[PDB]
Structure 1
Amino acid sequence: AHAEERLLKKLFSGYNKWSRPVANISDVVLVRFGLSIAQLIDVDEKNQMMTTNVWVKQEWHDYKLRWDPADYENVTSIRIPSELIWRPDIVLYNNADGDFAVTHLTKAHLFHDGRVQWTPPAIYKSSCSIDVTFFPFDQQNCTMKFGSWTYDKAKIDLV
């Protein structure tokens, strides 16, 4: 716990959250992006919206958050606030009456090799076109478009 305070003091001593965490400019940050649906809250046919509860599973490597476990009483991983670190700005392009980015900001699971795991919850209201030709036997196909807003492929790449 004194190591953890020492660890957190060490990691955030000279950390800059506004700069992409790459040791080399030409490097590209790989973001492993995956969804986990909790419940399909609503499918508003009249407004052609879909409200879903998901866990936006993200994972990227931050080269400035690495430490040797042997030097810190063998700390393998720690939980750090997500508002203190640089997180990719993945937004829902086809949003409708909802939030573009993830707003909860739960803590992230940081490992000793720089890997960061972040799985915040979210409630997204995405617009999807609804066909009611065979209602009430219809089959809707509603999509969500996720991508980094500011960073292009040469800087942030999704997996």
Structure 2
Amino acid sequence: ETRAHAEERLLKKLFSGYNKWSRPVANISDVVLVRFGLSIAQLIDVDEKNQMMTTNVWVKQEWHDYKLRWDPADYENVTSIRIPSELIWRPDIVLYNNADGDFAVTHLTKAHLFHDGRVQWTPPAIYKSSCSIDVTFFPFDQQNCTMKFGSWTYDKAKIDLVNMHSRVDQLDFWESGEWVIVDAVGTYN
């Protein structure tokens, strides 16, 4: 009767024959559409001398796993569960122009799983990326530092990226007092 017992039953059912190394599509010709978005916690550093930008961001990713589905009526109306992200298949999105940091997400927070197969995974990440610095009008200079994200090993026919929202989310942005963001927009290429 208790929610915990039904959740244990659901967890046992979901991961009975689950393979985390296989792309989660019912039919091979299907594409895993990954909705990708960025939320910037703070702009830690803009290193003009070394031409590196350090940022603290939340990498918002959402996709559908056809094996992680259930009917809540059979599990005491349990509609979603938090599961460790290292138990399930995840897209291998890496930062191409990494410099002095990590290519991929390393924190591996828990994923939010809904009864219709939707997976929402929003881990944090510190990124140190290269950007060409232009100091022609320093200290009245405006910089343009880019971050390039994409799946490393899956081509467009297997994983496709969808722009969650046009602009980087700044609702929880920690203002620095040295730099002001004029515009942060993601472009699909």
What TM-score do the two structures reach when normalised by structure 2? 0.83
1:44 is displaced (CA, Å) by 0.5
Q: Please state how far the C-alpha of 1:114 moved relative to its aligned partner.
A: 0.0
Instruction: Give the 4+ runs in structure 1 shifted more than 4 A.
Output: none
The whole-number CA distance in structure 2 between the counterparts of 1:129 and 1:147 is 20
How far did 1:112 drift?
A: 0.1
Distance in 1 (alpha carbons) for counterparts of 2:10 and 2:101: 37
The offset of 1:99, in angstroms, is 0.3
Distance 1:70 1:26 in 2: 31
Query: What are the Cα deviations for residues 98-125 of structure 1, in whole angstroms up to 9, with x where unaligned?
Result: 0000000000000000000000000000
What percent of counterpart residues are identical?
100
SS of equivalent to 1:64: coil
Render the CA deviation track for 1:107-154: whole Å, top value 9, x for unaligned.
000000000000000000000000000000000000000000000000
| Structure 1 residues 25-71: Cα deviation after superposition (integer angstroms, max 9, x where no partner) | 00000000000000000000000000000000000000000000000
Tell me how far apart the structure 1 counterparts of residues 101 and 10 of structure 2 sit (CA, whole Å). Answer: 37
Q: Deviations over 1:59-98 (max 9, x none)?
A: 0000000000000000010001000000000000000000
Q: Secondary structure at the match of 1:113?
A: coil
Cα distance in 2, alignment partners of residues 12 and 128 from structure 1: 43
Of the candidates 67, 74, 80, which is equivalent to residue 77 of structure 1? 80
Q: CA RMSD in A?
A: 0.3
Q: 2:25 is matched with which residue: 7, 16, 22?
A: 22
CA distance in 2, matches of 1:2, 1:22: 29
SS in 1 for 2:153: coil
Question: How far apart, in 1, do the equivalents of 2:11 and 2:73 lie?
Answer: 16
Listed as ranges, the gaps of 5+ residues in structure 1 are: none
Which has more strand, going by share of residues? 1
How many angstroms does 1:10 deviate by?
0.7
Aligned partners of 2:14 and 2:46: how far apart in 1? 44
Cα distance between partner residues in 1 of 2:47 and 2:10: 48
